[PDB]
Amino acid sequence: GPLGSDYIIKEKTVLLQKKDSEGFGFVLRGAEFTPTPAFPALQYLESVDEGGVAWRAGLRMGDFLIEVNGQNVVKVGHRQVVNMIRQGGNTLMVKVVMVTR
Ligand SMILES: *C(=O)CCC(=O)N/N=C/c1ccc(C(=O)O)cc1
């Protein structure tokens, strides 16, 4: 609008179940910190394997990670989030947000 940006924020919470011999099918990457609509979390999905577990559940490149297995990760560093995901083994429940104009 004439007074500032307009955009849509879409929240997605998904349950990922994978087999032992595969990954969840995404690459996590990290971008004193206050979340903003243009920068809602420290970790985001740099890529998502088309047809992989995460893709089939509805996760997409560019999604920002808000929660992992009931723990908020908005302000959590990359290595700690990786450990939280691995702690769940073949199960990952994650909330993400995707921002678009
Ligand atoms: C995890 O594998 C996601 C991809 C990723 O994190 N790649 N990291 C690249 C990188 C790390 C450090 C430096 C540097 O010190 O200049 C450059 C690039």
Author numbering: 651 to 681, 689 to 758
From the reporting publication:
As a model β-strand mediated PPI, we use the GKAP/SHANK-PDZ50 which, plays a role in the organization of synaptic protein complexes and has been linked to several neuronal disorders. There are >250 PDZ domains with several therapeutically relevant proteins known to exhibit their function through a PDZ mediated interaction. Class I PDZ domains bind to consensus sequences with a Thr/Ser in the -2 position from the C-terminus, with the C-terminus hydrophobic residue and free carboxylate being the main determinants of affinity. Here, we used dynamic ligation screening to identify peptide-fragment hybrids linked through an acylhydrazone bond, that are able to functionally mimic a β-strand and inhibit its PPI using GKAP/SHANK1 PDZ as a model interaction.
